[model samples]
Target: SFSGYLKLTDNVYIKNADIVEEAKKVKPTVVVNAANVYLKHGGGVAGALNKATNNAMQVESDDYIATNGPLKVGGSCVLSGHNLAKHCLHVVGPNVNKGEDIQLLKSAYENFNQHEVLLAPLLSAGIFGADPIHSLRVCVDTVRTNVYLAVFDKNLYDKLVSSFL
Candidate 1:
């Protein structure tokens, strides 16, 4: 994982850490799950996160979706943090490759900035194909409160660091 914290501005910072690992240990933290419209905790980060919560997260989300239905791109909601975080926030990010709303992704991050301790992975950068460089730029620019982004991949982590140069 990436190491240390780098400030993009006064309030926003990027840190190299596993979101799932940090969510369970950190105080006053809300794990932001980069989710689909249905809030299914599928493979990759979502899979790990649900497993971390011992499946309570998935159950809670399953119940939530039953009532609220599908989440729109850029839409978000807070759910039971389960055994890990103080709270869990799920954001529905756009599938950038499908020509989805990049701005909504930005908007999602912007809203999360209000929370004091947001343990966020690079949203949509995984299977959704959000570009790391452009995504980081939007995330960096939108910082209004304390936000720490976790980077999982070494190459992408280094690329983000190199961008800071």
Candidate 2:
């Protein structure tokens, strides 16, 4: 009999099975906090900033998006595969700083405007570093979007892997 069908059987026979153990196996668990951190900036390490900058420029050139004096950028940053419910984040950086971080975030966020997307705060991995908490703090301080942190289940081992993996 197939496993699926066996599960539906009222009385299933098994060899050397403990009833308590079987009940425990069927118990549902709600994972309190589970999040993936340490995504490679721009899908790579050590040169994510350059890659993101180049990508932003290419996007601008292709779409003819430019600024006469300066452009106020708004958008999201890709948080790599680390984020589960959030793959990107709505971000905005100051324009007075030549718009490097601002443009990058804007372009990334804008890329998903027409689709159902999940966004989270991200640090400029290439410029500063890929620190979610730090990046979120910077965004709040610089843009003052009134964002706050929420605690979630996270695997410390995975975070360790993200640091250099």
Candidate 3:
């Protein structure tokens, strides 16, 4: 049997799995949510985590605003009580539909370079609607620590695989 993983580097891995499922296995020190500056847990991995944690994720995200303003497109904020991981890193990614700078996507992952183990979804692939192939490439190139990219969308997964080959 083959495992559903692609080792991009010694520390970086791409997994064809659900974010929540892989998060459970990795038990990452941080789970990076591909979020918007508004910090709404409306869809994507953010919504899944919000629902799993009984709204604790959103509560923590809301609290971040008291001092951090709406997070910048390339910026990040931290939250806790996620139940699935020690901390949730909320990163604002590019909104391609609005003509936002795609390069900012790299900065989003860069913000968590200090962390040891990070589990993230395909940033900007969901609600933000950016190209998954490009977003995944940026994430792989930017984040310096051990990063596990949990990709759930079949089409995105196929594209990612094709890009690597």
Better of 1 and 3 by TM-score: 1
For all candidates in order, the CA lDDT equals 0.78, 0.27, 0.78
Per-candidate count of clashing residue pairs (backbone under 3 Å): 1, 7, 0
Runs in model 2 deviating more than 4 A are: 1-62, 66-70, 73-92, 95-115, 119-121, 128-132, 137-165
Candidate 3 regions exceeding 4 Å error are: 1-4
Task: Supply the TM-score for candidate 3.
Answer: 0.89
- RMSD of candidate 1 to the truth, in angstroms, is 2.4
Q: Residue-wise lDDT of candidate 1 within 44-68, one digit each (tens)? A: 6788889888888899989998999
Better candidate by lDDT, 2 or 3: 3
TM-score for each model: 0.90, 0.24, 0.89
Residues 1-165, model 3: lDDT tens digits: 114678887677887788776666656678888788878888888888788788877887777776677988988877773667788888788888778998888887787687887778877887787878887778777877877788888777878978863
Sort by TM-score, top down from the best: 1, 3, 2
